[PDB]
CSV table of C-alpha atoms and ligand atoms in Angstrom, one decimal:
chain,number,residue,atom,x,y,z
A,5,UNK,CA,-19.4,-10.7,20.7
A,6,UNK,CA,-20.8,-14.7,20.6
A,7,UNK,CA,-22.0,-15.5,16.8
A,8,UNK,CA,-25.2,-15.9,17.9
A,9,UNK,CA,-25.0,-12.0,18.4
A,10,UNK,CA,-23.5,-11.4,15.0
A,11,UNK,CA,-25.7,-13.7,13.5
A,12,UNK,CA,-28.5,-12.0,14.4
A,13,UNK,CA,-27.0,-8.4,13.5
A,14,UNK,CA,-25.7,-9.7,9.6
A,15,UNK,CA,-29.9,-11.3,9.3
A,16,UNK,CA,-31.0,-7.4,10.0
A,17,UNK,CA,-28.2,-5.1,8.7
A,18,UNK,CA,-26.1,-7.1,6.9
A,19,UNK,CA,-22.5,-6.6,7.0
A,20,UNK,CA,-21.2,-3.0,7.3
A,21,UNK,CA,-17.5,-1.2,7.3
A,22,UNK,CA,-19.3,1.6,9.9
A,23,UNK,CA,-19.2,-1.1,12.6
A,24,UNK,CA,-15.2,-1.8,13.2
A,25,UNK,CA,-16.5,-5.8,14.7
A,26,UNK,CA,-17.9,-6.9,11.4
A,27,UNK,CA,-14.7,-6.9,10.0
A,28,UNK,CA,-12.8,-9.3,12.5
A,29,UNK,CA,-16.0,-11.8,11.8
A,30,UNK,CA,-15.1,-11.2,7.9
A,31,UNK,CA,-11.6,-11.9,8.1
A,32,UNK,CA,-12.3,-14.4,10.5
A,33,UNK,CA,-14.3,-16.3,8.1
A,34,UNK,CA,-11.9,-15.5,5.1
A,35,UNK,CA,-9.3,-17.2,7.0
A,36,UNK,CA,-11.4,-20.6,7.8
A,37,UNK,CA,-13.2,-20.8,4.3
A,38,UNK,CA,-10.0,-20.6,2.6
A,39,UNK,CA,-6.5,-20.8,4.4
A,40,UNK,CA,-7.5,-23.1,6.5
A,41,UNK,CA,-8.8,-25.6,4.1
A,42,UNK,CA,-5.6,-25.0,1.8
A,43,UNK,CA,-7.3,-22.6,-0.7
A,44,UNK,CA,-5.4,-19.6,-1.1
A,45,UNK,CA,-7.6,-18.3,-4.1
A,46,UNK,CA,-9.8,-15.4,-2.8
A,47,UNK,CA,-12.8,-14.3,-4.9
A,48,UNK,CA,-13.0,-11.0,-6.7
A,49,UNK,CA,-16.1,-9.9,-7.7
A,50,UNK,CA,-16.6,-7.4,-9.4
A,51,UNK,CA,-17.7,-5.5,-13.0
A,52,UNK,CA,-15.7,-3.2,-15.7
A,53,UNK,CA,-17.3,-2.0,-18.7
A,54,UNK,CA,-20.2,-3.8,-17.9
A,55,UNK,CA,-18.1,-7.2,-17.8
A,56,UNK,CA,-18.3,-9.4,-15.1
A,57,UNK,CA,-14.9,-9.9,-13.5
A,58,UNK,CA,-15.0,-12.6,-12.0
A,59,UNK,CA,-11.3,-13.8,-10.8
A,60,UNK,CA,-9.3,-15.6,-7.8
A,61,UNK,CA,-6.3,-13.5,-6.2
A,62,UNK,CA,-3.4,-16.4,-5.0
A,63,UNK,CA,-2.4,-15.6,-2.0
A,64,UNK,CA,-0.9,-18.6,0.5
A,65,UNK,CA,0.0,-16.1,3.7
A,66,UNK,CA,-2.1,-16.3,6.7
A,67,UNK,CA,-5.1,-13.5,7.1
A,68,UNK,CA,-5.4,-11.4,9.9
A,69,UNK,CA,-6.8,-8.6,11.5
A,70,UNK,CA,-5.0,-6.1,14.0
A,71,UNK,CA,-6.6,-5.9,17.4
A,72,UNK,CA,-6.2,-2.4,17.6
A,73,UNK,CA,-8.4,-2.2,14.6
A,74,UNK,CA,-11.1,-0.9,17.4
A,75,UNK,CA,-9.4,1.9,18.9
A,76,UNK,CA,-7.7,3.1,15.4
A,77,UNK,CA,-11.4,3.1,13.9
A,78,UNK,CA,-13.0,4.6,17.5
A,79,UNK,CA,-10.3,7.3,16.8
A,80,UNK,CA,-10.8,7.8,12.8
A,81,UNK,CA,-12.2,11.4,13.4
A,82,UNK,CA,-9.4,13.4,15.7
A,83,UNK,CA,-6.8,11.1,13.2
A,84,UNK,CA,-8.4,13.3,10.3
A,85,UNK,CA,-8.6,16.3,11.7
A,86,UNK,CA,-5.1,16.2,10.7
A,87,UNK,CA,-5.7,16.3,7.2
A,88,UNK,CA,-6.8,18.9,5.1
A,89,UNK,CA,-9.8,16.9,3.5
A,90,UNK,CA,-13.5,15.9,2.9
A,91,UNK,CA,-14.5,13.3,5.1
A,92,UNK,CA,-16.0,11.5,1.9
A,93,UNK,CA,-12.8,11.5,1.0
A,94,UNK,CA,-10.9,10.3,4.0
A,95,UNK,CA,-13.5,7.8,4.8
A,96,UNK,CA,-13.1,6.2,0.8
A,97,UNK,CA,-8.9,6.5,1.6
A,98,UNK,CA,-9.7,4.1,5.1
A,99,UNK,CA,-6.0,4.1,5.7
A,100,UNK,CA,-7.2,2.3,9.6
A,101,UNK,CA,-8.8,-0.5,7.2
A,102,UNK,CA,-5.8,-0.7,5.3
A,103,UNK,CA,-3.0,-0.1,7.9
A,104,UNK,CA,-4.3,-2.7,10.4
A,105,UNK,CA,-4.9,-5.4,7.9
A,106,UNK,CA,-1.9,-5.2,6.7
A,107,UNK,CA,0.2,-4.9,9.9
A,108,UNK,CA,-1.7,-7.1,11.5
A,109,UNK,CA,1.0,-7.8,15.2
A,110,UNK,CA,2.1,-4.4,15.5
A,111,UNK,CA,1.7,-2.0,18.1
A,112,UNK,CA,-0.8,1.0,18.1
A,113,UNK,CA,1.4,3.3,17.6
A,114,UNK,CA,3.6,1.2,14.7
A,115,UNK,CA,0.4,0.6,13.6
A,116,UNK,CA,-0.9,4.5,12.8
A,117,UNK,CA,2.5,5.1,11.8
A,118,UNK,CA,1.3,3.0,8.6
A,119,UNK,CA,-2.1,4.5,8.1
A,120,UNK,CA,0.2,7.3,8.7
A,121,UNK,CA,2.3,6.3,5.3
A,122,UNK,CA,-0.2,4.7,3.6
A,123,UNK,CA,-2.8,8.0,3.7
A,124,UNK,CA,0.1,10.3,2.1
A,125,UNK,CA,0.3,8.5,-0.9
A,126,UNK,CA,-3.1,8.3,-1.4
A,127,UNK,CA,-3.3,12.2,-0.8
A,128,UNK,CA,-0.7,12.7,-2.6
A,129,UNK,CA,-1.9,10.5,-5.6
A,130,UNK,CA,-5.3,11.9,-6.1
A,131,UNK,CA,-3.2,15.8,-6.1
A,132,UNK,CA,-1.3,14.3,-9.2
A,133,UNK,CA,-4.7,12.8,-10.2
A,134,UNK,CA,-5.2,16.3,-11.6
A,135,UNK,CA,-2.7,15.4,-14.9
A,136,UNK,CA,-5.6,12.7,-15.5
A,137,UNK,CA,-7.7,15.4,-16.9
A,138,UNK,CA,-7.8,16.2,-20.5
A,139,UNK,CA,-5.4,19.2,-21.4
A,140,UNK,CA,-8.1,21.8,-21.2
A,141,UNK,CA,-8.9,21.5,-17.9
A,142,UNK,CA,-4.9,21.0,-16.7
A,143,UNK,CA,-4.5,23.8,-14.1
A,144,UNK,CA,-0.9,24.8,-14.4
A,145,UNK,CA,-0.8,26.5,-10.6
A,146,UNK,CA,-1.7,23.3,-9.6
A,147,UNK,CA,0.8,21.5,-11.3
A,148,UNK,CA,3.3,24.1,-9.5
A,149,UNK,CA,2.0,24.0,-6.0
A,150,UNK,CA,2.1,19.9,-6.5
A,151,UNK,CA,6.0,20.2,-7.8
A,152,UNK,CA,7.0,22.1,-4.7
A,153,UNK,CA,4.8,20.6,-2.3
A,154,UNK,CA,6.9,17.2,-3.1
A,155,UNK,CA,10.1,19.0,-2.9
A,156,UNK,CA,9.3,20.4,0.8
A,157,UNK,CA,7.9,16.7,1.7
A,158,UNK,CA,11.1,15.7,0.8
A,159,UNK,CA,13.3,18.3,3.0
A,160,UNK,CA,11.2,17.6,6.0
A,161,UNK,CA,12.1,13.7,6.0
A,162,UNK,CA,15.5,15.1,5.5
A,163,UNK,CA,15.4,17.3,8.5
A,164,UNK,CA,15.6,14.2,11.0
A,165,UNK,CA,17.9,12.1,8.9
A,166,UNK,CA,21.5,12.6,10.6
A,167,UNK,CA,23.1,9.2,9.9
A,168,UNK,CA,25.8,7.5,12.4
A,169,UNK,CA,27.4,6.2,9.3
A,170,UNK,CA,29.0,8.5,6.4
A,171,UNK,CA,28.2,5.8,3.7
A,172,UNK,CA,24.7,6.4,4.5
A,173,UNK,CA,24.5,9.7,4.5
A,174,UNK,CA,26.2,9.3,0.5
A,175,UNK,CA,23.7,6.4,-0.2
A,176,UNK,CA,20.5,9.1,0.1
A,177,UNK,CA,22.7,12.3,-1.3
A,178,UNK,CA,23.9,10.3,-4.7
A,179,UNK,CA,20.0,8.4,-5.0
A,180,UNK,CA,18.4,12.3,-5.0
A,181,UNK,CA,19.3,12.4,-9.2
A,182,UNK,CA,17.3,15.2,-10.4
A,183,UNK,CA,16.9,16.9,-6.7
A,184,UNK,CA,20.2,16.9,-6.0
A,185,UNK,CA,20.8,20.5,-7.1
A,186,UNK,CA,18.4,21.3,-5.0
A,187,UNK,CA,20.0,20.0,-1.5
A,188,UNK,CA,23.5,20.6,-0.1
A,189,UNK,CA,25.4,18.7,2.8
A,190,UNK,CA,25.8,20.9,6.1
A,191,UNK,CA,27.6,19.4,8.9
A,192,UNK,CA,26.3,15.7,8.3
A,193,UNK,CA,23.0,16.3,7.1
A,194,UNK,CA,21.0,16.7,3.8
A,195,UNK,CA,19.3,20.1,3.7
A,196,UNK,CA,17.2,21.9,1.4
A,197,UNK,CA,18.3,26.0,0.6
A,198,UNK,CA,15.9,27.8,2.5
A,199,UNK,CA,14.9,29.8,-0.6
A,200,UNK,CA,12.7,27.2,-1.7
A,201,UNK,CA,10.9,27.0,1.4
A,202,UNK,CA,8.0,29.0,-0.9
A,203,UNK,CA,4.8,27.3,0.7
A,204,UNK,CA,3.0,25.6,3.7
A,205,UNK,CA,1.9,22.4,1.7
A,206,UNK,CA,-1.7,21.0,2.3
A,207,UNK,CA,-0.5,18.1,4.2
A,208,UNK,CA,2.2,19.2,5.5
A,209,UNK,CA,1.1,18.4,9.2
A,210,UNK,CA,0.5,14.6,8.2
A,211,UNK,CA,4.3,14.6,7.3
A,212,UNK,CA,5.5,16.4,10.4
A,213,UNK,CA,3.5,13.7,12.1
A,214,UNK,CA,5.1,11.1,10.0
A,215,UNK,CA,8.8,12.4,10.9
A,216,UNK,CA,8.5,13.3,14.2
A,217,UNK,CA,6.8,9.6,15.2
A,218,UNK,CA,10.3,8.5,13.0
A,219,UNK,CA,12.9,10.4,14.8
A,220,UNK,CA,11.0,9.8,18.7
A,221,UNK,CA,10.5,6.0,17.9
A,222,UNK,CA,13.3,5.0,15.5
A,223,UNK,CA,16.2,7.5,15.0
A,224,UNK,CA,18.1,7.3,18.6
A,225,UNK,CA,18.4,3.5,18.6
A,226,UNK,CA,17.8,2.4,14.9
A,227,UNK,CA,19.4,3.5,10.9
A,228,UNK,CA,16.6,4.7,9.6
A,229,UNK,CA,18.3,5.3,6.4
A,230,UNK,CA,16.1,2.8,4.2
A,231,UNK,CA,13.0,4.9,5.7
A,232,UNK,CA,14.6,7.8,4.1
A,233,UNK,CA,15.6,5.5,1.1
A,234,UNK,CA,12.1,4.6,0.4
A,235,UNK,CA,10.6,8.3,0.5
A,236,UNK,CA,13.0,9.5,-1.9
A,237,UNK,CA,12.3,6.3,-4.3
A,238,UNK,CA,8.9,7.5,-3.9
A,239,UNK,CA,9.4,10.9,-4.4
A,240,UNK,CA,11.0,10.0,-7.1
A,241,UNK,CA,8.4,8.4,-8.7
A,242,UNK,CA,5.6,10.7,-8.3
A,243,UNK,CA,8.2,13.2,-10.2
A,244,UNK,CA,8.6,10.5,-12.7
A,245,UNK,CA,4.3,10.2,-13.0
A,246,UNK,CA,3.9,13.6,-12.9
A,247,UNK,CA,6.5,13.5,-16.2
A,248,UNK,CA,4.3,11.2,-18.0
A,249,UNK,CA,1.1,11.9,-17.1
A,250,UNK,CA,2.2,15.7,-18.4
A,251,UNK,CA,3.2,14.8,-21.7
A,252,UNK,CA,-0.4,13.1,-22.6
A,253,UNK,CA,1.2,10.0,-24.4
A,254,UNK,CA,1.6,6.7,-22.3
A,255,UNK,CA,4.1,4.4,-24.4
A,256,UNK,CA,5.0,2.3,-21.1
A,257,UNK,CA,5.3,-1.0,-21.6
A,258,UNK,CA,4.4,-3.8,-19.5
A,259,UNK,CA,8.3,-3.9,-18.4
A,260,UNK,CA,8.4,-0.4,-17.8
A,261,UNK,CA,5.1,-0.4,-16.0
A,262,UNK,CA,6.6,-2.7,-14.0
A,263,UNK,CA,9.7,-0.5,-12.9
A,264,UNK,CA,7.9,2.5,-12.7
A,265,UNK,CA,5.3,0.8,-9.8
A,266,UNK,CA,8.6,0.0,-7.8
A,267,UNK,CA,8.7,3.1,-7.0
A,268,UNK,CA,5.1,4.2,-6.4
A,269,UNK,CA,3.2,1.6,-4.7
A,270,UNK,CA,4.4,3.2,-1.4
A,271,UNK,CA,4.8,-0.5,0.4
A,272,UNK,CA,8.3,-0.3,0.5
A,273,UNK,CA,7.6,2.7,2.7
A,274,UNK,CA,5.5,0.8,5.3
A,275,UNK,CA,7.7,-1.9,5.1
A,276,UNK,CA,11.2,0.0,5.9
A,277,UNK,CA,9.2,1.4,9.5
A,278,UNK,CA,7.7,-2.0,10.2
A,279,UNK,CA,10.9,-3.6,9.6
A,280,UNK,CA,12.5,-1.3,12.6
A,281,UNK,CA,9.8,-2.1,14.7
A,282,UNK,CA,11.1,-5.6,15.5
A,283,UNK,CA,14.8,-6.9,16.6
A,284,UNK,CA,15.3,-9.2,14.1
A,285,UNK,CA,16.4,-6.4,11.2
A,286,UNK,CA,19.3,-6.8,8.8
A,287,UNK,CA,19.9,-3.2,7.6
A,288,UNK,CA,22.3,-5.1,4.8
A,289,UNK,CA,18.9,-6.9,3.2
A,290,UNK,CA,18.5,-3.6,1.4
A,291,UNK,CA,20.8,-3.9,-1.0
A,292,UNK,CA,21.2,-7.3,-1.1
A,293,UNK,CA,20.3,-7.8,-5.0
A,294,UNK,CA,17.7,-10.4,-4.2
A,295,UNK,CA,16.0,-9.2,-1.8
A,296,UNK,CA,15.2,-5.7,-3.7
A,297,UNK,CA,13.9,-7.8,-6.3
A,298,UNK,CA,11.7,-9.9,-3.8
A,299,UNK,CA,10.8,-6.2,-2.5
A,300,UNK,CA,9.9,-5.4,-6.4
A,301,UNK,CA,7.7,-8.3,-6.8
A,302,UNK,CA,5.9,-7.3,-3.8
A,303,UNK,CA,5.0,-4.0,-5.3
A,304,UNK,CA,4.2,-5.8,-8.6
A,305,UNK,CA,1.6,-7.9,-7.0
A,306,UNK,CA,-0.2,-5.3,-4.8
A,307,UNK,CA,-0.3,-3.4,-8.1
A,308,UNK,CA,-2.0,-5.8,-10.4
A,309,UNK,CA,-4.3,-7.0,-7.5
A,310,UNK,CA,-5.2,-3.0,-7.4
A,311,UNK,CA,-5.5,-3.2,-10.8
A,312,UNK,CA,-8.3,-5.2,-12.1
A,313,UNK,CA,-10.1,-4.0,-8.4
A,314,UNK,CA,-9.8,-0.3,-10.3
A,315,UNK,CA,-10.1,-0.8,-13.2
A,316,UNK,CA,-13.6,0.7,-14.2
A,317,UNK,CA,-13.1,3.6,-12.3
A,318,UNK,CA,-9.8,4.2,-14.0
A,319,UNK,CA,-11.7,3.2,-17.3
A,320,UNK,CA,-14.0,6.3,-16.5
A,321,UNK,CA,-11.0,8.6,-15.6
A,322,UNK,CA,-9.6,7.7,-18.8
A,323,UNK,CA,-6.2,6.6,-16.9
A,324,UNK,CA,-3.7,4.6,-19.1
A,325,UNK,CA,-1.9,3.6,-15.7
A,326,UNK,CA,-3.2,0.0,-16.0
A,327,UNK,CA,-1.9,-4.0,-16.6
A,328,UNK,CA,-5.6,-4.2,-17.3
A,329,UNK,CA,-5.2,-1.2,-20.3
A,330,UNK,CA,-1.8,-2.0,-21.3
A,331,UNK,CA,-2.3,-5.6,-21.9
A,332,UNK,CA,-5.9,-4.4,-24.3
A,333,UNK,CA,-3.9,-1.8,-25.9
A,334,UNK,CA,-0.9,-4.7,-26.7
A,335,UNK,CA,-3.8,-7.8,-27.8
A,336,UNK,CA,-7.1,-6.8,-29.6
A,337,UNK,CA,-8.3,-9.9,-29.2
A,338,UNK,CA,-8.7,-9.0,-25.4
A,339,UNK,CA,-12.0,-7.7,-23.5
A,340,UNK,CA,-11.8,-6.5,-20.1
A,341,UNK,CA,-12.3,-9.5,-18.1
A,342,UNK,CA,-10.1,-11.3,-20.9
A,343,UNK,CA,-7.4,-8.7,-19.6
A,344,UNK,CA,-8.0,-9.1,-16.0
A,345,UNK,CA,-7.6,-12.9,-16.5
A,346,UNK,CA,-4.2,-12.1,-17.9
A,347,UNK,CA,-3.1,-9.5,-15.1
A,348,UNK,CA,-4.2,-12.3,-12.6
A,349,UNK,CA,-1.9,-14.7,-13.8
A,350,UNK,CA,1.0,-12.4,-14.1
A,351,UNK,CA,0.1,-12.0,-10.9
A,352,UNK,CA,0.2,-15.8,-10.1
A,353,UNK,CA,3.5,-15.7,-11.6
A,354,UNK,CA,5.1,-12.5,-9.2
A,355,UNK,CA,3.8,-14.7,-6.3
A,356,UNK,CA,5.6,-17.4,-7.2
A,357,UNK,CA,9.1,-15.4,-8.2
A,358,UNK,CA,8.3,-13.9,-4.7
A,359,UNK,CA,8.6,-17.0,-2.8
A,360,UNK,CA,11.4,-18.5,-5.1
A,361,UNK,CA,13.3,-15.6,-4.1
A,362,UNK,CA,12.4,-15.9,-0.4
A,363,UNK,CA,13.9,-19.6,-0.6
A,364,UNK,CA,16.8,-17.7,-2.2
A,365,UNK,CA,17.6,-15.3,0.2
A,366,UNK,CA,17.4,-17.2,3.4
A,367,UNK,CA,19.3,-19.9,2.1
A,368,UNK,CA,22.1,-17.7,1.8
A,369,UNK,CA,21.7,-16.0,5.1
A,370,UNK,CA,25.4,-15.9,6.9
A,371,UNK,CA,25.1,-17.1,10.5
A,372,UNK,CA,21.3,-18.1,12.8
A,373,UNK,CA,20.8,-14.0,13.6
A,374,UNK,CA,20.8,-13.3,9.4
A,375,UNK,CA,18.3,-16.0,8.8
A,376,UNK,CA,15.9,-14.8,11.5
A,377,UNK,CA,16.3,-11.6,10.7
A,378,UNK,CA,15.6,-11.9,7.4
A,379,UNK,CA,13.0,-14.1,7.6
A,380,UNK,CA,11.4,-11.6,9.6
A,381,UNK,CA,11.6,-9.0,7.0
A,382,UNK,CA,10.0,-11.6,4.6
A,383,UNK,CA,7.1,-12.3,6.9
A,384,UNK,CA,6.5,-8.2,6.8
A,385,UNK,CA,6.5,-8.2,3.2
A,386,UNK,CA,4.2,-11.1,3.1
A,387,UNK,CA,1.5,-9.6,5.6
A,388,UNK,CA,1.0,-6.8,3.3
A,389,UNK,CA,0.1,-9.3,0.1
A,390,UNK,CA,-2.3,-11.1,2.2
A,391,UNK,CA,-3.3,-7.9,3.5
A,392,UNK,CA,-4.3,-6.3,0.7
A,393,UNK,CA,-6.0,-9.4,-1.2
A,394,UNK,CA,-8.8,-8.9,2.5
A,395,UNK,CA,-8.6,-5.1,2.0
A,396,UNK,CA,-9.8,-5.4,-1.5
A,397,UNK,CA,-12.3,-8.6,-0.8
A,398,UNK,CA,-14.0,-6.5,2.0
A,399,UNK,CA,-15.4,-3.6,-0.1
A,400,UNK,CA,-18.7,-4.3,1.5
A,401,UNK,CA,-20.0,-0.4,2.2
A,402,UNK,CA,-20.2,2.1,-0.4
A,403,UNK,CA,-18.1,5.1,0.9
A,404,UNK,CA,-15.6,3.6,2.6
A,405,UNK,CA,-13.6,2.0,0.2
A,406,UNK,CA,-11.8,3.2,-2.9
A,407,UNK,CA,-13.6,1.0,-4.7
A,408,UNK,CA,-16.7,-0.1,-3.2
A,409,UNK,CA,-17.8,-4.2,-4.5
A,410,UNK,CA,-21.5,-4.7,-4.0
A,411,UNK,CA,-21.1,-8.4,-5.6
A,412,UNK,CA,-18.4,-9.0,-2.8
A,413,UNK,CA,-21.3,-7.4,0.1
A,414,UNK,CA,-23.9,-10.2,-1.4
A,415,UNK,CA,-21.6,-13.1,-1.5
A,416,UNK,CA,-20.0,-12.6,2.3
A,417,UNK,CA,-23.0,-11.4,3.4
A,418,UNK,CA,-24.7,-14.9,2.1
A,419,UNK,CA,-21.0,-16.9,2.9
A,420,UNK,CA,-21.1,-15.4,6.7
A,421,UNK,CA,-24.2,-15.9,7.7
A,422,UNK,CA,-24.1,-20.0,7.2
A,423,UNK,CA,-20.6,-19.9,8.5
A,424,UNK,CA,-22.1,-18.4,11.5
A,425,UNK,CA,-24.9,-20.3,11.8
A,426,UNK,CA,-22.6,-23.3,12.0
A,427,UNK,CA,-20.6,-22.3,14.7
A,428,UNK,CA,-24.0,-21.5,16.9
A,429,UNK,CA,-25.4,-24.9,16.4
A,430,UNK,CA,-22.3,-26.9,16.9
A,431,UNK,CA,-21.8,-24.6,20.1
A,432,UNK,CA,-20.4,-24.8,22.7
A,433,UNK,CA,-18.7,-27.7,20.9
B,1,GST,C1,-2.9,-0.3,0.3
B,1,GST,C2,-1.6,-0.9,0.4
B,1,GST,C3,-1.4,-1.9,1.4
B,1,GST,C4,-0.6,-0.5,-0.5
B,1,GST,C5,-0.7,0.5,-1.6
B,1,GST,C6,-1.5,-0.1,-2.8
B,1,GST,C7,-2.0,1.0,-3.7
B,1,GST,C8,-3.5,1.1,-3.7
B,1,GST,C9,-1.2,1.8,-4.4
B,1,GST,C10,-1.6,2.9,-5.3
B,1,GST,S1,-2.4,2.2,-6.8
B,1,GST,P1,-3.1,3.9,-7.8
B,1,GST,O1,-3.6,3.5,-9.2
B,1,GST,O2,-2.0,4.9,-7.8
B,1,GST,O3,-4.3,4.4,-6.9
B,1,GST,P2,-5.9,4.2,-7.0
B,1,GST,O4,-6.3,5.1,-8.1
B,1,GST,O5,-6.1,2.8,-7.2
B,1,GST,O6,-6.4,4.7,-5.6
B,2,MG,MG1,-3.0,2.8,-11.6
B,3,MN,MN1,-5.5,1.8,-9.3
């Protein structure tokens, strides 16, 4: 469309998340206000407790919008068809929102494959959600059908790992811990014993879509054994959440808060796929020591940015999961929006330990084909931080966001329609 024609549309209807163009324009606009006049501090607008939060995320990576965007939204219902869900539910998930902002210059298909990733740990979150209940509502089938369902999630990503290397294949069997016991090498590969096989889990087909686009796309030409890394990290974690949340006392501190969302935020996840998705890849970057603390910083900083943008629903929900709640339950002099002030500069902080470890880890790249390849896994990484500041900033319709930020539809809504203006008179200048 011209921007005489959005123009027009924003005057009437505003801007919407039901119309898949508005979004370009928004991001569009993000990236000239901002980026492109060297301001890297995007507003958040929003309340908690009835306190205005109102903060800056830092974030110095170029915004962008996937052009498939289009055909992943004109697709949105078939795609959830797969799920067993709600559509109010799927719509407030928006893993096409999420996905192709923050794998912007990917492919379709690489591109679903991260709504793909993104979408099970948000379904897989809100079934350990349940544990946020007070105790005399905890539904201890639940909790059971939740502990296996994780357990068969796991075997199924195990069914299409056959490693060419044996090291690999000991890499994912000794990092199983406390599932181990559970799993036993036959003939090269890690496989569950068929007497737990108790259930068809609820999401089971988004999974077998998950593995099966791994194994066609991936598995015959690349080591997709820091795909199956990440999984059982996350895995991992859930089990670890599902621990704490169970016990009913949260004594995490700000550290431990920290390690425990290296293992959650589910980023690693998309980023190990992406990662194979282009030919400059250094499988050794995974345990290079830097670079999964560069990795850790990334999950830090999606998680404290997700934290002040949910924090007064998780207030309601009574959630201690929180830099906003920890911080408060550390300082009494803090308020909310004193907290969230807090959490944005440790945020500040992550950013710049993420890009003083980036200058790190190239610099001791080996040989031309190490730096580029690495610096290609660092560009990933950095799509997703930008990525997610824009997912959160364009909360603009109620039900299609996890947590929808009227303050954020008035001020774009007010911000776009001058910046389109602009670009009509000055036309075709
Ligand atoms: C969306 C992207 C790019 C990465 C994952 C970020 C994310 C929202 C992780 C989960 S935070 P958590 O508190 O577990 O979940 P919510 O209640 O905020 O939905
Ligand atoms: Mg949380
Ligand atoms: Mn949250």
């Amino acid at each position: 469309e011209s921007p005489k024609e959005v123009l027009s549309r924003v005057q009437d209807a505003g801007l919407t998340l039901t119309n898949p163009n508005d979004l370009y324009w928004m991001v569009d606009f993000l990236k000239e206000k901002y980026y492109d006049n060297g301001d890297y501090y995007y507003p958040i607008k929003t309340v908690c407790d009835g306190e205005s939060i109102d903060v800056k995320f830092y974030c110095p990576f170029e915004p962008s919008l996937s052009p498939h965007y289009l055909e992943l939204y004109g697709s949105r219902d078939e795609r959830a068809s797969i799920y067993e869900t709600t559509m109010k539910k799927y719509n407030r998930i928006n893993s096409e929102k999420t996905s192709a902002i923050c794998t912007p210059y990917s492919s379709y298909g690489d591109t679903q494959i991260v709504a793909y990733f993104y979408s099970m740990m948000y379904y897989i979150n809100d079934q350990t959600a349940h544990l946020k209940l007070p105790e005399s509502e905890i539904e201890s089938e639940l909790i059971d059908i939740l502990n296996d369902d994780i357990l068969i999630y796991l075997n199924e990503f195990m069914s299409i790992f056959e490693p060419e290397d044996a090291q690999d294949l000991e890499r994912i069997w000794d990092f199983l811990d406390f599932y181990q016991p559970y799993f036993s090498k036959v003939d090269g590969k890690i496989v569950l014993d068929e007497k737990y096989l108790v259930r068809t889990p609820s999401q089971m087909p988004l999974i077998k879509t998950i593995c099966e686009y791994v194994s066609e796309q991936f598995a015959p030409s690349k080591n997709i054994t820091q795909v199956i890394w990440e999984v059982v990290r996350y895995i991992k974690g859930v089990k670890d959440e599902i621990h704490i949340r169970g016990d009913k006392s949260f004594t995490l501190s700000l550290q431990e808060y920290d390690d425990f969302r290296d293992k959650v935020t589910a980023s690693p996840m998309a980023h190990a796929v992406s990662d194979l998705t282009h030919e400059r890849f250094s499988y050794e970057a995974y345990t290079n020591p830097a670079f999964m603390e560069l990795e850790n910083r990334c999950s830090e900083i999606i998680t404290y940015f997700n934290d002040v943008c949910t924090s007064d629903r998780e207030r309601l929900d009574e959630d201690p999961f929180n830099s906003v709640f920890i911080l408060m339950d550390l300082d009494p002099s803090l308020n909310f929006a004193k907290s969230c002030d807090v959490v944005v500069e440790h945020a500040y902080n992550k950013m710049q330990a993420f890009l003083k470890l980036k200058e790190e880890i190239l610099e001791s790249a080996s040989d031309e084909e190490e730096r580029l390849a690495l610096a290609r896994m660092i560009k990933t990484r950095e799509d997703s931080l930008i990525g997610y500041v824009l997912h959160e900033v364009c909360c603009v319709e109620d039900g299609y966001a996890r947590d929808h930020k009227p303050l954020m539809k008035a001020f774009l809504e007010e911000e776009i329609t001058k910046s389109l203006a602009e670009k009509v008179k000055f036309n075709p200048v």
